[PDB]
Write a protein that binds this DNA or RNA. Structure first.
Ligand SMILES: Nc1ncnc2c1ncn2[C@@H]1O[C@H](COP(=O)(O)OP(=O)(O)OP(=O)(O)O)[C@@H](O)[C@H]1O
Ligand SMILES: [Mg+2]
Ligand SMILES: [Zn+2]
Lengths: 649, 358
DNA sequence: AAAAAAAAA
């Protein structure tokens, strides 16, 4: 009755108290006006409020929102729409577009306290309450528009009529249902023609979010919940993404309380009307002094060795492997030609060795430190299901392709373990990807080519239990040469027994195990921790807090932390695209001619494709030092690394 | 019942301006009378409307302070309504045939003449105009240079991707781009359905624009309207009016797909003389009307507000390339003369296939 | 449509 007006005026008072939101709204308005008629982006009518200030202003309204949003959000939205209408000033508007009536829906950020849950923790007593849930995106539905309000016209009357339709998921408050019956006749029988272009249609999509399997009870499968979101943010993110979704958790449907029930045990349906979505990413933007520090480090002489040594400090030796991983994470550029079609741009690395030489651990480290990566096991995968699958959507009743493991890793890196133990059939499915970086699906009436430009890193064991240095390299490796020729670098590792190395590695490994997490005692095991205190988060250059990287002093050479290295990778993969020059060309051609005509035994045969590997390695090294041109030093280091990987020191 | 709202659009002035444009337009005299004259002589089978002509006519008549509004904006905002406005304007201003007609072949007109000589002799039914209509109406999207000619942002075109089409583009005229994959066959579609009345006066007609259809049971014939039944009404195949119907779907190009996604599709309906103007496996620039389609055909009683959508074709630019089956032309004749002058050819042809391979 | 167990080649 009047409580709606009371809440509306209180929210108007609160909006008038804080002057940031008004500035944002008028900025949106002026940008929208400038987009209209000046020689393709438009800002949506959505604003995000920080409920910390609301709590500091009025505790009653804050509690009402966080406990029963159904009776508090609509008044706030009405007040915001009224403010926007009052402040707006358009003297000559349009006809069809003026009847949009966007209500300026809201988004929230700030501390939630006990209302930040996980998909398993959602229970009965959290219904009808605003919540924020973390999780992983499992699968999505198709974007389908839905009607809101229809526009009708009658020729005889000349008066435009309108009828409004709402559903259970359309509004927070339950109202009397309305069918989709089109009004075609007037009260006096005049004919009504539906007017497209004046009616209102809003986009609709359903997604399902799953709890992270890492934080799960022992011996329990992960559980998932479904989220409905509409209008804006309709097609953000994708399956295989870590998200934080804030919205209202409410039930819907009769659920058998009508006469349709067949058995006693009938349960209701629960669903979340998502209000906002944030990318978790376990942040992604560089600051000014960050760029200053990156430039200062890149102008140093020996940045590349420092960066290589910084990777996985708990692994002894394998320095060239670390350098190869560093060059692979930020490989060369892709080439396209009007007549030359397409040229591959990145690097793939394969390692083979006898057991217990720290390959899987390095693979896990590469998974953890990469921008985007997917873990795959040879035995626990099927090639047909690795690329694409056919699934029938429950809503639309049609069958649509579901993205496979490798497609999700587009512009990423894929790590495969037990590669030599992986079925031969599915191997061809890999080779196709290694051929043109594109998978073709022609099955059940769907003919589509899907882009997959990822890099693949794998580690495999030799045919015997241990490597035989006296045998043919082809004899020791079970994989056929057809796919082995694709990999740019092949590495063979062996645990040669030497008492000096044995003592050094023993001391190192014992040093690692004598570690204690900061601020926690040694008498009790590790305990799980809660989420961050802030549900949604966000003097320069004189501190160098984490810029220098050296957390602990152990050697004269420097070190850098993981976040700074990742920021360096993000900057390098975007801001620099080097161009090769003839000075490095001479060195590359000379060393290729020399290596080809050395005429001695070697691990693998060499052919014309190795020069492409040299070119992209030089490009990657030019990217490492952040230069737009390729110097002969990059050619020299690439040749040295190749000689090490193929001859051995 | 239904609340009423006020809109700045009124169709009276729009129709008057449409008629004035159709009559007075100078590009042979007026062009839009030449097309109507060819249609009257049963020569032209479809009518194409250029929005650039309307825009430039309005712009050049704006120099005199008589014009008050613009039409192309309302065309872009809504399209289906202007189709029936245009067909009514054409039907009102159809000139007489200046050429002879082989009148015996038009069996529809012969049957209608027989019905008229039956009914009007007694001293008759006013048949719907679309049954009498023989032509098809098509629109053509404007060109960007014409928009550049003036200050206004009358742009349209802009061949959006399949996934770039949102729920706010329903009812507008939009242009899409993509590869055609599936093309169905050609099948007739009903426009006006006629029933015979078993020799009981006039034969009842009906027109259904929906995708479903229901038949009649009783008829308005006077002796049939008499208190006892006189003959069961039966559908007549000859008297009805049909139209060619075809459907196809288009897929997004691989260049426009965002990373880590699966391309989407779009359904296209096509009717009239434009049928069979496209083949599977080509890049096209299709312009049409983006219309909603009811879900009730599936008959699931779900998705109370969710609906399916489709595009109705209006103009197709086939684009891509043409094989032409080496059809002889003058230019290629001078080309082969140049080849004759070139001397020995096959060595250069071998050198010129794949220079990238050494 | 796609994964998993069984007997015969
Ligand atoms: N250089 C090293 N530094 C630290 N730990 C090492 C090193 N070499 C081996 N290890 C240890 O050896 C153990 C074996 O690990 P892991 O199984 O990942 O190795 P691997 O060589 O990939 O073996 P596999 O062929 O069985 O997969 C690990 O606990 C790892 O810490
Ligand atoms: Mg291992
Ligand atoms: Zn009868």
């Amino acid at each position: 009755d009047a409580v709606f007006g009371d809440r509306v005026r209180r929210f108007q008072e609160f909006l008038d108290t804080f002057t940031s939101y008004r500035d944002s709204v008028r900025s949106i308005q002026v940008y929208n006006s400038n987009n209209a008629a000046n020689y393709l982006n438009i800002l949506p009518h959505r604003i995000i409020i920080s409920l910390d200030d609301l709590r500091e202003f009025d505790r009653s309204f804050w509690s009402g929102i966080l406990v029963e949003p159904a009776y508090f959000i609509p008044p706030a939205e009405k007040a915001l729409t009224d403010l926007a209408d009052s402040m707006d000033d358009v003297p000559h508007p349009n006809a069809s577009a003026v009847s949009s009536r966007h209500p300026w829906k809201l988004s929230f950020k700030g501390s939630f306290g006990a209302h930040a849950l996980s998909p398993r923790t959602l229970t009965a007593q959290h219904l009808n309450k605003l919540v924020s849930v973390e999780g992983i995106v499992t699968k999505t539905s198709l974007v389908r528009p839905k009607l809101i309000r229809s526009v009708h016209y009658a020729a005889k009357t000349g008066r435009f009529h309108y009828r409004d339709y709402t559903d259970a998921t359309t509004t927070l408050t339950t109202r009397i249902p309305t069918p989709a019956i089109y009004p075609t006749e007037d009260t006096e029988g005049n004919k009504l023609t539906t007017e497209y272009g004046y009616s209102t249609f809003i986009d609709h999509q359903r997604i399902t979010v799953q709890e992270m399997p890492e934080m799960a009870p022992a011996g329990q499968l992960p559980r998932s919940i479904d989220v409905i979101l509409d209008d804006d943010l309709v097609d953000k993110t994708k399956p295989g993404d870590r998200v934080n979704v804030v919205g209202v958790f409410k039930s819907l449907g009769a659920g058998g309380m009508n006469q349709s029930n067949s058995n006693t045990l009938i349960g209701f349906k629960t669903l979340i009307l998502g209000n906002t979505v944030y990318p978790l990413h376990a942040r992604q933007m560089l600051t000014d002094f960050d760029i200053r520090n990156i430039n200062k480090l890149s102008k140093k002489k020996d940045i590349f060795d420092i960066l290589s040594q910084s990777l996985a400090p708990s692994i002894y030796g394998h320095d060239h492997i670390k350098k190869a991983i560093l060059l692979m994470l930020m490989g060369g550029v892709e080439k396209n030609l009007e007549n030359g079609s397409h040229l591959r741009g990145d690097i793939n690395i394969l390692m083979v060795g006898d057991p217990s030489t720290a390959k899987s651990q390095l693979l896990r480290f590469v998974l953890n430190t990469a921008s985007l990566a997917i873990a795959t096991t040879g035995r626990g995968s099927s090639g047909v299901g690795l690329t694409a699958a056919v699934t029938t959507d429950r809503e639309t009743g049609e069958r649509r392709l579901e993205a496979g493991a490798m497609v999700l890793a587009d512009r990423g890196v894929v790590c495969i373990d037990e590669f030599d133990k992986m079925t031969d059939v599915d191997r061809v499915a890999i080779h196709e990807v290694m051929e043109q970086q594109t998978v073709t699906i022609a099955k059940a009436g769907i003919h589509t080519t899907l882009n997959a430009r990822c890099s693949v890193i794998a580690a495999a064991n030799p045919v015997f239990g241990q490597y035989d240095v006296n045998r043919d390299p082809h004899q020791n490796i079970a994989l056929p040469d057809s796919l082995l020729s694709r990999f740019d670098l092949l590495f063979v590792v062996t645990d040669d027994i030497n008492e000096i190395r044995d003592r050094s590695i023993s001391e190192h490994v014992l040093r690692t195990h004598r570690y204690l997490p900061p601020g926690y005692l040694e008498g009790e095991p590790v305990r799980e921790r809660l989420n961050l205190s802030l549900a949604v988060g966000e003097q320069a250059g004189a501190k160098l807090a984490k810029n220098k990287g050296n957390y602990n002093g152990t050697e004269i050479p420097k070190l850098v932390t993981i976040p700074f290295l990742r920021k360096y990778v993000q900057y390098a993969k975007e801001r620099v695209i080097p161009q090769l020059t003839q000075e490095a060309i001479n060195v590359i051609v000379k060393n290729y001619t020399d290596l080809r005509n050395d005429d001695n035994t070697k691990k693998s045969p060499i052919t014309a494709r190795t020069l492409e590997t040299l070119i992209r390695l030089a490009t990657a090294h030019a990217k490492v030092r952040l230069s737009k041109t390729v110097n002969k030093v990059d050619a020299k280091v690439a040749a040295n690394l190749l000689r090490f990987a193929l001859l051995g020191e | 019942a239904l609340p009423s709202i006020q809109l700045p659009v009124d169709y009276n002035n729009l129709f008057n301006e449409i008629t004035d444009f159709l009559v007075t337009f100078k590009q042979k005299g007026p062009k839009y009378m030449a097309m109507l004259q060819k249609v009257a002589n049963r020569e032209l089978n479809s009518v194409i409307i250029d929005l650039d002509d309307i825009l430039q006519y309005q712009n050049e008549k704006f120099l005199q302070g008589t014009q008050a509004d613009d039409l192309v904006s309302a065309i872009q905002q809504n399209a289906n309504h202007f189709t029936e406005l245009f067909c009514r304007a054409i039907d009102n201003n159809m000139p007489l045939p200046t050429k002879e007609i082989d009148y015996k072949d038009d069996v529809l007109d012969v049957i209608l003449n027989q019905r008229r000589l039956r009914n009007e002799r007694m001293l008759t039914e006013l048949f719907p105009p679309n049954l009498t209509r023989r032509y098809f109406l098509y629109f053509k999207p404007l060109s960007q240079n014409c928009a550049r000619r003036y200050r206004k942002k009358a742009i349209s075109s802009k061949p959006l991707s399949v996934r770039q089409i949102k729920g706010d583009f329903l009812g507008q005229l939009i242009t899409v781009r993509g590869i055609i994959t599936r093309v169905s066959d050609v099948k007739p579609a009903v426009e006006v359905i006629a029933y015979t009345c078993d020799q009981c006066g006039y034969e009842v007609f009906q027109e259904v624009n929906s995708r479903t259809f229901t038949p009649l049971s009783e008829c308005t014939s006077e002796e049939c309207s008499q208190n006892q039944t006189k003959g069961q009404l039966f559908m007549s195949t000859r008297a009805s009016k049909f139209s060619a119907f075809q459907e196809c779907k288009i897929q997004e190009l691989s260049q426009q797909v965002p990373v880590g996604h699966i391309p989407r599709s779009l359904n296209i309906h096509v009717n009239g003389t434009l049928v069979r103007s496209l083949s599977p496996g080509d890049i096209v620039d299709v312009t049409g009307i983006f219309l909603p389609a009811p879900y009730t055909g599936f008959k699931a009683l779900k998705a109370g507000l969710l609906t399916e959508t489709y595009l109705e074709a209006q103009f197709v630019r086939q684009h891509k390339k043409k094989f032409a089956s080496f059809s002889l032309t003058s230019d290629v004749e001078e080309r082969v003369m140049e080849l004759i002058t070139s001397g020995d050819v096959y060595n250069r042809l071998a050198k010129s296939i794949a220079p990238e391979i050494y």
